[model samples]
Target: ESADLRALAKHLYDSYIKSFPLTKAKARAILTGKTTDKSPFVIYDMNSLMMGEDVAIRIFQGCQFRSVEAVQEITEYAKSIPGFVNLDLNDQVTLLKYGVHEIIYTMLASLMNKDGVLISEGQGFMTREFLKSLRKPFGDFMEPKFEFAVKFNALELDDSDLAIFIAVIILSGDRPGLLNVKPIEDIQDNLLQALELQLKLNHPESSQLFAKLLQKMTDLRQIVTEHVQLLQVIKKTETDMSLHPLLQEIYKDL
Candidate 1:
């Protein structure tokens, strides 16, 4: 018996990648580093170096909202799957809390190039250089994510494979706080089997690809682990720059 993994794959694809681009920016600036402000999106105030802080906060919050919505979308998808909602309610929230950023970065990798994501569907762009330039703490916080994203792209799994892999990422019971590890692990095991079946349709001998996709999850968890550390690593050390209240709560767990 076969599952309609392709149907599900297409759903994931359309929901994230195949739909409209998440960010919008200048293509010309991205392609060549010689960028001019050219009345860029009104982040700056009427000429003040102090505007940097305000801009960073705004950008951080905007990116924060994007992250929030993306995670919620994943939660909805989680429920759509068979038996996912049957898991404990707190456990559901726990998975989203811990796994959300990892999944967000996972999907971001699909849109990335060596530089960064295209903003405004190719009209504008957000480069690694541009991101790391954000004020005090936000700069250091986000740059590493793009770095991992660039590396993750090397595995070259298309949208369908990634669709299943992300399911695996969310369902894994590796984290410390799962209220019911065995049940969640069983769910992860089921997802693994489902993803493998999905792979066989596209990859005939699917073994190596199968191995790589799962390996990439381990790698992704490691990368996100470092990102989580940055919350502690930055705010504690910086001493002056502040995270928005929203970001602080998100990071407070670790």
Candidate 2:
């Protein structure tokens, strides 16, 4: 059984290593540092030294586009999970619908620090103060995620550990409208077991690492819940805004 556990953990690690470049620890070290690529995607307007709503809208719009791109990457990772595709199709969507934001926020730790995230694929850094400067709820939306990312980064899980952790997030049995809870739960339990094994191998000096990671899962759900509330507000008030249809589908009933 110990050998079987090692084999399962290795499988999960390879799935992530082969699928996504962004989730790679090498990429994280580059993106979260000051030495990444420079970008042309500027959020500054000549009058932003005084203008307000326009900056918020621009930042929100950029974030929206980037998140749509993240959806594709995350979907790629989700499908790579060993038992994920075997679940009923609706259950898959249900899991992704409720789960993508948490994973997205989780991945944010790869690209962020205590201040802000990298935008334009390492082209630029968006500061926390800049994000917090938006109007009303818009201004308030991202600070919590930044706060979460800042703390989550402190845990220092590498890319492979994060890969399994994200699998645990997407395979949760408790997502609403799940049609095959038993199978999903089974998958989740195995991933958590793998994660525990990885933590032991990777962070032997730490006694509480696995427990702390699980607590962050709870923290992510709280952030995701608040994130949806903000998105729902945006949908109602920003009728002129063009949200990605996929994102619209996920948030439509939330």
Candidate 3:
């Protein structure tokens, strides 16, 4: 059982690492526009409050761009989870549709600190202050995620932990319209078991780490709830701002 757990952890971590775009430090540097490293990514300085009319639409477009990539990354990672493909196709769609926002926020934590998160593949840095200064829908859409990312970083979870945690999120049994909750729950339980053991191994000295991570799942649910509502508002108010069709479909039922 221990051997199986260790192997599963390594497999999931490898799968997750491939889908993940940047290391925490690399992403952080890009977000802060302080990177001196030689790389292909361009740094966009969005620190100024004095901005053009296009700035709002550009930022919103950047978010839509990242969300598309994140959704693809997340969908691939979800398929790597054991037993995920065994579910009905409709159920799989339902899970991805409902769970992608929280998973995206979780992965976004890697690219974030208390200061800000990277947008447009690290080409743009949307500082928290700059984000707040935007129009209500854009700012309101990101605020809850920024708040969650800030607190989540305090847990100091590495990629492997995040891999398992994201798997747990995707395989959650409580999502609406699940036709086969038992199998999904069983898979999620196995992931939780693997996660608990992995955390104990990685954070041996830390207390209540498992429980704290579970609480973050609940926290993500609330963030996604707020996010969905904000998207509804944005759709009605910002007709000029185009959201990707996949994202539009995901939010259609919500």
Top candidate (lDDT): 3
User: Candidate 1 on 1-254: residue-level lDDT in tens?
Assistant: 35465565566555544332442122334444556644223222323323433466555556766666675677766665555689998788777677777777887766566765654334444556666777577778767777776677666566667666777777878775788888888878767776777777777854677777767778777777787776566567755545556446656665
Q: Give the runs in model 1 whose Cα sits over 4 Å from its true position.
A: 3-54, 120-123, 134-137, 204-207, 237-247
How many clashes show up per model?
13, 0, 0
Model 3, global lDDT: 0.79
Deviation (Å) of 205 in candidate 3: 2.3
Tens-digit per-residue lDDT, 74-171, candidate 2: 88878988888888999988998889989888877787877567665654556677677664677788777778887888888888788789889999
Strongest candidate by TM-score: 3
Instruction: Please give the lDDT score at residue 89 for candidate 3.
Output: 84
The RMSD of every model to the true structure, in order and in angstroms, is: 5.8, 3.6, 3.2
Clashing pairs in 3: none
Error of 2 at 139 (Å): 1.9
Span of 10 residues, lowest total lDDT, candidate 3: 44-53
Instruction: Rank candidates by TM-score, best first.
Output: 3, 2, 1
Which should have the higher lDDT, number 1 or number 2? 2
Superior candidate under lDDT, 1 versus 3:
3
How much lDDT does each candidate structure score? 0.64, 0.77, 0.79
Once fitted onto the true fold, the runs of candidate 3 whose alpha carbons sit more than 4 angstroms away are: 25-54
Score residue 142 of candidate 3 by CA lDDT. Answer: 67
Model 2 misplacement above 4 A: 31-54
